Each structure stands twice: as C-alpha cells, then as structure tokens.
Design brief:
4 copies of one chain form a homotetramer.
Chain A (H helix, E strand, L loop, with lengths): L7 E5 L7 H11 L3 E6 L2 H13 L5 E3 L8 H11 L3 E6 L18 H22 L3 E11 L12 H21 L4 E7 L5 H12 L8 H12 L10 E4 L16 H4 L3
Parallel strand pairs in A: 1-2, 1-4, 2-3, 4-5, 5-6, 6-7
Helix pairs in contact in A: 1-7, 4-5
Organism (chain A): Helicobacter pylori
EC number (chain A): 1.3.1.9
Catalytic activity (chain A): a 2,3-saturated acyl-[ACP] + NAD(+) = a (2E)-enoyl-[ACP] + NADH + H(+)
C-alpha cells in the first residue's frame, strides 16, 4: 500500500518536530520511504538525530547550504549510504530578522543577498549537486508562501525570494523533466506578534475557517513526492484551507473579522 | 483500505473505461471507497453497470444533467442506498460540435447556452441537490482544462465554460467551506487513447503536449485518476478552491520547447520534422 | 483632441452620466473621438440623447442585447451614419451561488458574456484596421468577492472570451481587452462595505474615480495601446495586489483603526 | 494638453536609441515631460548625453547601480537641479552570459547574485534613494518579461530575477501608495532590431512571437514607449502594482497558433 515503499529521500531543513520538513518526512515514513536527513549545525543536530531515529533513519548529514564545501561530502554520503535518491525535500528559507520588519525599501543589499542565496540559490546548488543520484521518476519539492505573488504584511524580501523560488521551480521542471524528474512547490498557509495576527486572519477568513495542520502540509508534500503525482510538475500547490481564493475579507453583510470583536 | 476506506462517493460522467471519471473511480476503489455511479442514458448504462460491478458497486443511477426531473430521484436514491456522501466527482463537459468548429465569434446563442448549462450550471445543480447528504470533510471535484485561462485551438466556448467552472469552484469553496466541505478542480492534460487517435485535431494537441511538456510525455488516465483520488481523500484536507494541474508540467511553458542544436535554440517540434 | 481624432467609436451601456461607459466616452471625446451611443429602451433614450450631444454626438441607436432583432438595424445604422468603426465599448452589466436558478444563470451569461460575441460579430465587417474592442470586468472573476456569485462566473467567462476574441480578431489587426475596475463611490449596504473596504486596504488608500476608469479605457481604445491585446487591465488603486488586509508596528489592521 | 507637461522624470537605463528606456523617454518628451538621464560610465555618457540633449535635457548623471557610492550624489544632483521628481523609469537588467545559456542548474552563485543585484535590488536602492524627492502622485515604472512567470528558453536566472522584480513591484506599491505614489511593471514582448536579429536565439523567439501572437507582429519600441508613458502619466492614476503586458497579445496563447483548412489543423509555425 505504501506510496513510497522502498523509495529513498533526502529531507533538508528539519529544525525540530514542528518543522514543515518534519511533517513531510513523517508522512513519507508512514508511506514506507527510506529517509535521510541533514542538519544545519551542532545545535540543530541535537534535534535532527532523535527525529531521524524516530523515523527509522541512521542517515544524518551536515549541510549548511551557505558553505559550498558541504555539498561534495553530502553527495559522497548519499552515494555511499543510499546509492541513489527518489526524492528531495528542500525546506530552507532565511532572511535577517530586520529585513522582515518595516518596509522593503529599507532592505540592505547584504540582507537581500542572504535571503536570495539561502532561500533560492540553495535549491539550485542542492539539486545540481545531487542531480546524478536522482533516479528516473524522482521528485524534488520546495516550500513557498502566498507572499510570493500577493502582498502579505511582514514578508518584504521573503516575498521576492519566494517569487524567484517559484520561478526556479518552473525552470528546474524543464531542466529535469528531460530525465523524467519532477519539481514542484508546496505553498503552505500558516500553521499554529505578527504571526498570531496572520494565523487569526487566515483562520477567520479562509474558506475552511481553520488553519492548516502540520499533518495536512505533510500529506500534501508526500503526495507530491510520491508516484501518485507523476503527472504533476512545475506546480505551485496551495495547502492553505482555501485562503488563496479570497479576494477580500469573508463576510456573513458584515465582515466575519468584525463579528469576532463581538 | 487506504485513504477512502469506507468513504462514500458518487461518480458522475463515466462513459467507458477511458473516461476520466473511470480513472478517478478506479483509484478511489483501490483506496477502499464505496462507489456509486450515474449514467446519462441506456446506451451508456450498458457501460456504466459492468464498470460498477468491476469496482464493487451495486449503486447505479440515471442522471442526464439536462433534465431537472432526474435530480430529486438521484437524491432519493443516494439517501436510500448510501445515507450520506463523502465525495462527488463531476466529470461533465459538452458543447455542440459546431461550437468547437470555426471561431468563438460564430457561436450561436443556443450553442453558447447549452455549453454553459451542461459544463458549468450542472455542477451547481448537482451540488445543491446533494448538499444535505454531504458529510463533514466531504470533497467535491470537477474537471477542467488550460483553455479556461489561455487560448487553446478548437475549444472556443468551452474555454469560456471552463473559466466559469473554475470561478464556480472558488465560490463553492467559500459556500461549502463553512461546513468543512472542500471543492476543487483538476486541470488535465490530453490523454492518448485509441478513439482519440482517430481524430486529427486531437492528434495535434496530443503531439504538441508530448513534444513540449517538461516531462516529454502525455499524462496517463492513471495519473489523472490518482491526482483526483488525492483531491477527494483526506490527504488533501488542507486543499480547497484549488485548480490542480495534472498535465506533465505543460502549463509552465511560455513558448515551444527547444534543444540547443548546432549552437541555435532549435524547436523540438522542428526536429521532429 | 489627440489620440482619437477622426476615430469612430460605439459606446454600449450608458445609463446616465455616472455610467462607466459614460466616463470612457468622456475621455474619448476629450481625445477628439467621433462617438455614437446605444440605448437600452426609450426610458434610457431620454437620458442617453442629452449626454450624447453633450459629447457632440447625434448618433444614438437602440440596442437591447437580449433581442436579436436589434443587431442588424444597429449595423445598418452605423454603416449609414459612420461608415466604419475604430473602437467599441461594451459596458453591459446584469443578473449563494448554490441557490442560483438555471434561469438566472442563463440570463447572467447571455447578457454579460454572449452579448460581447453577438455585438462584435455583428459589427466585425465595419471594424477598421487597428480597431479596439473594450469590455468591463471585476476581480470577482478570479477571486471570491462577497455578493458577486453568478456574476463572478460570468466575468470569468468574459475574460476568457477576451482572450479567444483577441485571437479571432488579431488576424485582422483588431485588439480586444478588458478593463477590470475597482468599485466607484456614487451618491446599498453591501456596496458601502466593499467600497470602504477597498478604500482602506488598497495600496493607494482611495477608491478609483470615474475619470480614472475612463482614462484607462481611453488608453486601451487608442493607438497608445496598439501593442496591447488580450489584456485584463486593473484600474483599482492597486487593490488586486493585496493578499490580506492592510496593516500598520504591532500588527494592527488598518481596518480596525477606522 | 501633453500628458506629462511640467512633470519631471528620471530615466535610468538608456544605452542607445534602441533602448527601451529611450523609447519611453521619447514618448514622455512628446507629452511635455522634463527629463533627466543616467549613464553607466564614461563610455555610455557619449551616447546618453546627446540623446538627452536632443530631448532638451541638461540633466545627465552617472549611475552604475552596482556602485553604492553613486546613489547619494544622484540624490544631491536631482535635488539641486530638479528639486523633485514626478516619475522614475527603471530599465536595468543584467546576467552573466554563461548563465543565460545552458540550464538554470549550472548557474554559479556569483552569477546568480550579480543577476539578482543588478536586475532586482537596484530598483529598491534607486527608489529608496530618491523617495524623499518623489512628489504626490509620482509614478515608478520598471521593465519585465514573460519569463518571470513562464518558462522561456535561454532566460534561466533572469526568469528568477524578473519574478522577484514583479513581486517587488507589489510590495513597493504598498510601501509607496500610502504617499499616493504608484509602482508598476511593463512586461514587454521582444522587439526586432538590426543587431538583435543577428543573434540566432533572439531571432527564433522574435519569429515565434511574430507568428503566434494574436496580432501576428512584434511590438515596436514606440508601442512599448507609449504604454510606459501611459503608466507614468496621470492617465493611469488608478493603476498601481500592475504588470502590464505590451506584447501583441502573446501572453494569452496556451499553445502554438493553428489555422483550420479542409478539416485539418495545421500549426501556423509549420506554414513557414
């Protein structure tokens, strides 16, 4: 029954058991996948290793995507331990906290470059590094957010990065489709300051009147990584309780948001 | 015993084992669903019944969406035999043949109305009819095509219909989301079949997709069916109001595919000849 | 009297001097256009005729798009009086979604969508090289908007028609576009809500004016936009870019401040 | 009755008389605008200065967007010479030449960063530098291409850049709209030019556009310039955060154009 029975996958971006990458990894494990994990540094190694064992994986590799010299060891590790890969989860996004404040206009060039390098270029370098180990039918998944194509408060440069990221998905889908490899983006809604407001705005205004769970994001990701979605590539797939369809605030005509004030 | 283990679904639009609705039904059956089927007419009934038997279904009902008289009995049947529904597949699209001939400019008002009624309004009437029987968490799926949002040849009024259909999906997602019911559209690429291989305009669209899609293939009925099953299952419980492309990536292409040949970006279509 | 001299245009959908079609007609007149107008019925005639020759037009023709008998006399009239056309303005408006009857659905689709097909097909032989056809739409076509329902289906179909007609007519160097307007304040409870809401949350923190919609329409009808076809052009103070309500420090919605 | 009479605008990105920035500048000049221009370096000043002089402009300033030290003098210049600005044209895009060939997968980190910096961040730095000089009602325009949102051959990292650029347009529209300042992007189709039809890849995309666009033509520099002028003028008062396609309709096509004849569909491309 397992939709990834016997398929090998690399999970990049687990920070703890609430990480999107962990939800996806857990659903993939439940579908029979053979998993491997990366960790950013020694601090996150303390969280990734127990998670990896939780999910039956002894394959745990150091990868700081900002360090070019990490990629060639990763390749070697994967080749020695797994031999090949059937899927990659790329769940990596970072901007300086300050660039996530105020206005886009005040973004520094260094903050811009860091956001673009970590959030966008790392998908290129990761896929190019592992590109020879990918089996026929392999699937590469990255993560995105509605701020790529609409204005959302408190996104700023991350909105630029995610837009480029979704564009990269399209180009990579063409690059890798020649070899029957798929590339997709999962555009997730927020999962339970500014975050509490966006959570509540999504909860009040989404068609399903709820925030998505980590499990729902993980199951959608597993679907995109599995052969169930072998006809799907270059897709930006919204897992957001329907929020993306809303052109305005939801109403009952008074805004539901206003009813919530009593 | 998978994701639809024990979930009840109505499949509208099976004409034969090549129907998109049949691919979706088959994948749902493989995931444990309890299925029911409609038939447009007695000729198609001869065909819906063996498919139903193959997918373990004794629930087979007459539904011609053009006849309003058929909806209340369908409701009565479903309430009698199944009690409730956890998913609906709406695979219904029709325009008179002359409407996909020529240009949109030449479409008759009667042909326009028939296309809109059968391809769009029927989703409203089916969903409103069955709305009281839908359980918490239910999922409604319709079918669409890139012609809704881009120009596609020999599509004409259907491109208008599919656009309206996708808009309907959004509005229904808001209407039904209050009750934790999801509504989505699967936008399928063309599928190569024996019958389709007998028509020239279809042959071109299939060949164009195969040559220019990122995956350099046409999607299979199995691939469309599995994507549909995903959207109907609890795996996609976070997904609503979505237009989900199952088209080998074709939707991403802004121009013809090229291969660098003899240092020049030559079209892949030209190399084919 | 610049970019639409000597250019002849038919304006469909004027009900009074606040109509979108009237704003567009006004801007075209200011650019030197020779205008003609349709009227729905004799009641509207009494209102269209004064507006017309306010814009120097004695060319006022009957058109209820729901009536096939009107379309050929219209062609004849235009050919008689104007000879040819350089632009057409199609500004025609009419209608839960689950509760929509087949009757209401068909009326909305016929009036809002099919009428562009019948009007353009009727007048196609009279359209000059470079002519421009403009219709009107709204964000409810592609996003959920409250109190829009079947009209959101219609406008979605309409924008799709714009694409297909752009291909049909571009063969003869004729352009087809849609202007997607934001709401305009005029002197109804839900409309008041969508209007303040747009005003509070739009990037420009204002509702668009009739003049702004009219000038954008003029641009699309003029040779200034001769490179533009099949376009849905948003004239909405930027509202279409918003993925959520606008904010002001500790995450406060601007909506909550007024 | 010029659409920009008395309005002051800065034009960034003129290299020659075939530049998109020059076409936009020409249409603005015809509508009464007071123009100012930047030049990349001493070599490009030779071309920019005379173009500016033919459009009655003595306001010619050095700006290499990669050199941060140019921005503060630019502000000082505009402030001294013009006092304020009613519009800005940002027509600046560059990727290394290897990155625009082959695949996106082979892009170096340095090439990626250069493309993002020159094509995207430069709009942020220019707008942030000149913001205090922007008058009520001002309009900021940048340039884009369909490769931002669809795959286009031999565009690669620039497709990433332009996608980011269009997203920036939205965010800036929100940032600046609170001061009644508009921000838009013009998405241009390819223009046929002498030099540009000597490169085989450009000639192929140009002919593909010409054959398959609804209007069966390539857009001209004049058409792009007039659309830009409109977006910079008060005529587009109600338009902000928009990506406006000036491409002969090409963006609507979901496939190659075909004709019908004797019950047979043939791709128009194949008729040539």
């Amino acid at each position: 029954m397992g939709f990834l029975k016997g398929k090998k996958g690399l999970i990049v971006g687990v920070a703890n058991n609430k990480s999107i990458a962990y939800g996806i990894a857990q659903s993939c494990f439940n579908q029979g996948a053979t998993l491997a994990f990366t960790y950013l540094n020694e601090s996150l190694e303390k969280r990734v290793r127990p998670i990896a064992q939780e999910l039956n994986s002894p394959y745990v590799y150091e990868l700081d995507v900002s360090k070019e010299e990490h990629f060639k060891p990763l390749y070697d590790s994967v080749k020695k331990d797994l031999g090949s890969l059937d899927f990659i989860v790329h769940s990596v996004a970072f901007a300086p906290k300050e660039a996530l404040e105020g206005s886009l206009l005040e973004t520094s060039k260094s903050a811009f470059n860091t956001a673009m390098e970590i959030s966008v270029y790392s998908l290129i370098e990761l896929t190019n590094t592992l590109k020879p180990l990918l089996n026929n039918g392999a699937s590469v998944l990255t993560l995105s957010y509605l701020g790529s194509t609409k204005y959302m408060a408190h996104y700023n440069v991350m909105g630029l990065a995610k837009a480029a990221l979704e564009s990269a998905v399209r180009y990579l889908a063409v690059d890798l489709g020649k070899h029957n490899i798929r590339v997709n983006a999962l555009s997730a809604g927020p999962i339970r300051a500014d975050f509490r407001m966006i959570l509540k705005w999504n909860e009040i205004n989404a068609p399903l009147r709820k925030n998505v769970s980590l499990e729902e994001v993980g199951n959608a990701g597993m679907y995109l990584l599995s052969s169930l979605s072998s006809g799907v590539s270059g897709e930006v797939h919204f897992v957001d309780a329907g929020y993306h369809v809303m052109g305005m605030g939801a109403v009952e005509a008074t805004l539901l948001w206003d009813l919530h004030k009593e």
